[model samples]
Each structure stands twice: as C-alpha cells, then as structure tokens.
Target: AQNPNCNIMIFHPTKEEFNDFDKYIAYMESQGAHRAGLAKIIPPKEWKARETYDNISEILIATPLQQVASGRAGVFTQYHKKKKAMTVGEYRHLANSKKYQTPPHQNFEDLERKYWKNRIYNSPIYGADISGSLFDENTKQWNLGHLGTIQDLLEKECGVVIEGVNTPYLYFGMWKTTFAWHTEDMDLYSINYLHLGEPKTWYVVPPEHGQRLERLARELFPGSSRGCGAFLRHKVALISPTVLKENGIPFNRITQEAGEFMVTFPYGYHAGFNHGFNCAEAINFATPRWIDYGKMASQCSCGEARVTFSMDAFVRILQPERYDLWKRGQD
Candidate 1:
C-alpha cells in the first residue's frame, strides 16, 4: 500500500524443522529471558458485537517470570500457595489487601470480575483455558525482548534479518485470537505455524477504518505504546480456514503439526478468532517509528508519556556529532 501508517508482514503456514513443542520450548529457554502466558482470542460473536470496546479477552499460559507467586504482572499462582487453601473469595481479598488498596470509587464487584476472570492479577485457584501470544520480553526493562526470540526465529528459523537490539516477541496458544484490529507501527509483523490444530485469522488495511483511526493514533500516541489505538484504526479483510468453515464461509487450508506461515498484515483494523477449540501459536513483532532512526522524528515530544522523551532520542544523543553514522545505519 502507499503512505501506510502501519507496516506488517503476514504469511501462510510453511513446512519446516523442529516441529516438536517440547523442542521449541527447550530452545526458547536456552535463549534465556523467556515469558510464556495464555492468550485467548475473542469469539466472533463477541468480537463482531463488542470489537470496539476495551473489554478484551486473553489468558496467560505457563511462565516463570509471570507466575502467580511473583506478583510481577501475570501472577495467577498465588491463590494456591497455602496448605489449607482459602476459598476463592478469601484468596482474592488477601491478594488485594497486600497490593494498593482497591479503589473505593469503583464498584468492588466489577473489579473482582476483572481480576478473577483472567486468572491473573487476582483470580482464585482455578485452571483457565489458554491461548494467544506467550514469550518474555527478555531484555532488561527498556529492552522488551526485541532482539531476542523475534530476531533468533527470523534468522535461525525463518531466515530474515531485521536490525535491532531488542525485538518484541509474541506467543499464541490454544484457541487464542486477536480482536479485529490493526496498527500504526509500520515495522510490525505476525507469524504463526500450525502444529496440532488450526484457527482462523482475518486481516485488512486502514482504508476500512477511515481517517478516524489515524486521528486517534496521533492523539493517543507518545502515551499508548501498547497499540490499543492501532487496533482501533485497522480493519480485517480475511479469515482463517477454521473460522470460515465454522461460519459457513467455505475455506480450506493445508495445515498440520508444524505447517508455518509469516504474514505482514497491512496496518489497520483487523480481527481474528478460533474454531473447534483448536490449539496454535504465533508471534507479533514491531517497534515504534521513533525506534527506527530512518523515520523523521517529530519536533515536539508530545502526549502524556510516562517517559518525557523516547528511548530512541537517548540513543541518537549517544554521540552529538555522530548523527551521520546513525542515519546510515537506519538506512
């Protein structure tokens, strides 16, 4: 596309080596600083109806860094730490008390649902279904596993070279799906392989969302690094085989245990879902435009950013008079 606000690369499944799940896990561990968690895809019914809302559906898979005991980010294991485990309510209350006080303004009942439903943050002892991306941001803080799994897989596994120190990594498992969405970071891509099961994915370009998405991206940016705005801006065009078949749309795909594909979705509003409760995995890779020195930097450090300026700016200032070298590298 021309003048695309977001850049993505998407592919269909491909046949390759190391098809075993155990082998893949071991390899990731060998690389170090891996985070694995469940991610659930929103159902079509919910996605079509509530795709515009913030109530996203996702789950955490198994991982050491995000395990429940640590209280790091995705801890859902603490509820069962005690020998005489307390009831779900008791455990939740205990966890909430330890952290900052639950806000008094918000209704307690609703917050409980948000915390307990995802099986992370504050849920009781109960095993939940798993799906969606899983992979730790291996690099230390500010180093979001950028050059880690994404780089290794692209080079060693699929054979692509994207320059970077840290590459964002993603993991999709079970029946996890992303709501119809898209992005503004032209540097992002999603790759998935069919191992045990098959699911559906729909992709589209920004034209679907109209100009509203672009405006929102600019307004929210320098603040919403997570790409919520990006999702809202893009629209979906295609659905995976499982989803099409389940929805009577008629689709067939050559998928099996280890069939892989890499796709660069046009950055815009796109959505995805699952069918038959199949299991699968995928990774989403991207970096902010500022991170790519090749792109022009806005004069003003805008928005309500947690960090006043971008980390990229710090890198640029690494050598006051060495601007030419950085430019050549980005090119």
Candidate 2:
C-alpha cells in the first residue's frame, strides 16, 4: 500500500504488462485486494482455536490474477499450459465418472437456511445462479441479514463503502457464474460472505499492500478484514489445516450456519463459486453501481482510474483523453 500518499494510480495494470506477477500483486495490494494476513485460519491454540480453525482455506485460494494461482485456475491453466497435464476431455471424464463428495449439514429450516445451505452434486458450476436474498450482516458473527449493517461495518473499518454483500441491492444471483470473478465492484472495499455452502475462496496479495495491511491489522483493535491469502473452503465440518498466523488473537472462524465475519485485509484479489458445497445456497450483494455501465463509463471518461488493474484498460479505451500520457500507459 502506498501509504495513501504515493501515487496509487502508478500501479495500474495493462495488456502490455500482463506477464508480470509482481506488478499484478502490487496493483492488487494498492487496491486492498490481497487477503494474506486478513483472515481467521491458522492461529495458535491458546486463542479461539475451534472458531479460528473452522474457516475454509480455499476462500483465499479462490482468487488469483492469473489462472495459475488457484486450484480451479491451476486446473484451467494446466489444461492449457501443457495440454497433457490433464486434458479438458480427461478432466471432464473425471468429473463425470466420480461421485462428488457431499459434506454434512442439517436440513434447512427457513428461507435463509434453505437456499444458503441447500445444494446438489453433479451440477455444472457455471449454470447455477445464486438463489434468494443474500446473507448480509455485521462482523458480529451473528445476525446474518440485510446490507445496511455490512456497509456500516466496512465504512467503520476501512473508510470505504464496499460493493460486496451490500451492493446495488438485489442482483437475482446473476453474479454467480463459473470463472466470473466477484462482481467487478472495485471502488468499494469488500469481503466475502459465506452464507451456507463451503465453496472454496482464493485471495492473493501484492507484496506491498499485503505487508502494509498486515501491519495495520496487527495493531490494537485493527479496523479491517484479515483473510489469509488464497484459501480453501471446506464443509462446516472441515477445519483450516493450514496455520495462517500465530497471533494471540486467533482468526474468528465464521460458521454456525448463520454466522458472519470480516477479514481485516487492506488489499487482495478474490473470487468464488455459487455453491461448490454439495447442497447449499449462496447469495451475494455488491454496490449496485458496479453493474451500472453508464455511471462506470462516466467515471472512466473522466479518467477515474479507480482500481488500477490491467482489465481496466477496456474502460480507458472508451474514455481516452481524460487520462494523461502516463495514465494511458498504466491503462
């Protein structure tokens, strides 16, 4: 993180710079997308061991700027990188041939429980859309409902309004498709809300912001989400095998079917599945402004390089002159 003083725009990504990992990580860091030290897994036992250990590691693992960073991404890239590592045809066969594992969970008792926790196996990852109202709540680890609380929490902790779990309101679950990155709501600060399923989520950190957020969160009553970079989300029964930290304050694993949490991350990359868990419901809310292209276009046209990243180049092309020469290069 550039200390809120350095030119944050300097870290923007471009098609020309796609091959560089460090640059990618740096840019994500500046935007507070890295989750390395901002989660509740892998803490020592003297602290809240059971709660901390219950979190899934794949949540952090679900995010990677490039496919090479995640299991799904790794699988996708491996299919393309070497061709023989595991052909798409073969992967398809493996998926179709085997009986998918269904994690244990109680039956749903209400609307919130039904969709957020109910899921089915052998379903294609992409087709399934999110169902019902998203699970929104404060970081209290309880009272999982509505967006107002989630937004307030973000503003209180990060000084930014997050587009996730509280966004432009209802999205009808359209944002939950395969390979579809989390709602492209960059300007807002955010964190994932695991309503019911145990879908693995992956997150990554650019070196600089990762270091800065880590320092910020470790302070007295750090005001941020602290998710470990790139995690695997297992069933409610599973625990984080990886020890992400040993601080006295262990990560407060957010489970309990309706529990909620806030990872103290200032920067990182993230993405996830609609319902990777055998039978569960997954709903998400993000700042509604994200899907509103007209507003986004206006901002882009004015050279608002909000979150500097390579993918943003498309916006730059739409609105060129507003940004300077260096801005053009960054875009």
Candidate 3:
C-alpha cells in the first residue's frame, strides 16, 4: 500500500553550512541520505532568490514526450498528441495561454494526488553553454556561483573551464514540461536549483533499485529495449510512482518550490514534470568518489558501449601519477 502522505527527505543547513554546498551534501551523504535516490535542501534564510534573469532563449528540443492512454507519458511510440518544437518565445506563450494549450484537468491537486492522471508535454530546452560567472555576474569574485556544485575538483585539476558539463545550464520550465527518467551523462551526480516560479514534481528511484527500474522500463518498453540493454540511456520514458510501487519497487516523490535545491545521486534514476512556469539552472558535477562510478560505467550488457567521455582521458588530464591523491579525496 502506498502511503498517501509520504515525501522525500529534506535537509536544512545553517548559513555557514549551506555556504559549503559540497561539504554539507557530503556530510548528509555520509549519513546515508542519498539512499532515497535524491534529497531536497532548503536554503538558509540569508540566501537571495534572484527576481529574474536576462530574457534570453536557447534551443535543442526533447521530442516524443507524448501522452500515453493509461495515465502516464513517455517518449515511447509517439502518440496522437502533436507537439511542435518551439523556442522559449513560443513555448512561454503556450504555457501562459489555454487556447494553444489544452486545458489541464480542472482538479490540479487531485491529479497530483493521483499523479498519473496529470499528463503533460513540453520539450527539454537544455544547454546554452554558459559560464558560471553568468549566474553571478556582479560578484566579481564569483564566490556565489561556487556555492553551486560548480565549485568542483574537476575544474581545479584541469585548471580550465568546461562549458555545459561543469559550468551551469539554465533551464526554462512551464506547465507540464517533462524531463523523463534518466541518469546523468556518465552516471555522475547532478544538482538543480529552482530559484523562481511554480514548483516541480520529481519521482526517483535509488541507486540500488536502478536495475529493477531498468527491468520495469524494459517490460514497459520492450521494443525499445529489444536488443539494447541500455534503453534507459535513451531517456524517452517517464513512469509514475504508482507503476513503480505496483511493481514492488519503492520510490520517492518530492516537490521543489522556489529557492530550493534538488540533488541527484550517482546511478539514481529520476524523472519530473514542472508545475507551471519556472526557471532553473542545473549542471553535471563530480566529487572524488564519482571516479569509481565512472570506471564502473564503461558499458551495459548490450553490445554498444554506454560510456564515451573517456575516463582514461580524464585521468590523463589529471596526471595519472596524481590519480591516487585525488581518489583519496586529498585535493
């Protein structure tokens, strides 16, 4: 039986502790907080939520987020829902107006309570190849951007900037926009900060249950997984907690409102939909321990290799002789 009132774990840190984002998260992670798949952190009172950002748009559409008949949506065999790839210019109009967009079920809360009933379609306007400085333009020292996971050992070792991977990518979300179930590029960790607009609803499965979720996904999307063992890599499928629970796989659900952070653990499977118009910035990052995950991520059971961002290349850049120092978290 699913608990109607269950929610994912939420952490609160003091201003000092929150100032050290990586340390605080590592502290909780040490206490096993990440076992739940993902965790939420509410910023300390002193943190300021930006009123807005410069109105700019970027492209790269996440197609096939079509609705399925049964109460869920997926990028599976495209449905009758004809959604076009639109720029933020047009997508915002669709989100703000009802005529261009179909009316969402009148009982919005009721749909969320019975989550599967709320099906939505929107594209992933991912990556503008931004700088960490863009997020804190006036802070000449740029310490504020470091408060994000952008303060990483990766950049320190390489001593250079990486565009979207280590640097931040701003996300624009509106009603029913879907980010289907998927892991980070190399099974690394991800952090998303929602600083404005309507809250987001996220459903996630822990690292331990990753295979089970993949198995369920295989069952749910056999044709896609037919010969490919890493179908989940396609990231076109989104499932509800009800289905996960029904399959005897446990899951957690959480709501990320304005001025909060959502962190994903290594190998955790996560998917979400936006509540309404919102702006978020997310970036892929790594701690020393993520190196183990990278080595373990070489390939799935399928013939095609699952990893391309070579670990050897990473080690080469960091100087193989110093690998032990970094792996021991000595940096």
In model 2, the runs with Cα more than 4 Å from the true position are 1-37, 41-123, 126-145, 149-184, 197-201, 206-266, 271-331
Among all candidates shown, the one with the greatest TM-score: 3
Worst 10 residues of 2 by lDDT: 232-241
Candidate 3 overall lDDT versus native: 0.60
* Candidate 1 overall lDDT versus native: 0.30
Q: How do the residues 266-287 of candidate 2 rate in per-residue lDDT, one tens digit apiece?
A: 3232233322332222323223
- lDDT at 132, model 3: 38
Q: Is candidate 2 or candidate 3 better by lDDT?
A: 3
Tell me the tens digit of each residue's lDDT in model 1 across 1-331: 3223332322121123223322433343233201111111111121111112122223333431112322222211132222342332333243245342233324433432333333233322221222332322331211222223334443454344544443233332222222323332332334343322333433333332334433433443333325333323222222232333343332112112323332332233334333212334444443221123213222112222121122234334433344454334333
> 2 or 3: which has the higher TM-score?
3
Q: What lDDT would each prediction earn against the true structure?
A: 0.30, 0.28, 0.60
Which 10 consecutive residues of model 3 have the lowest summed lDDT?
121-130
Per-prediction TM-score? 0.31, 0.30, 0.72
Per model, state how many residue pairs clash.
46, 60, 0
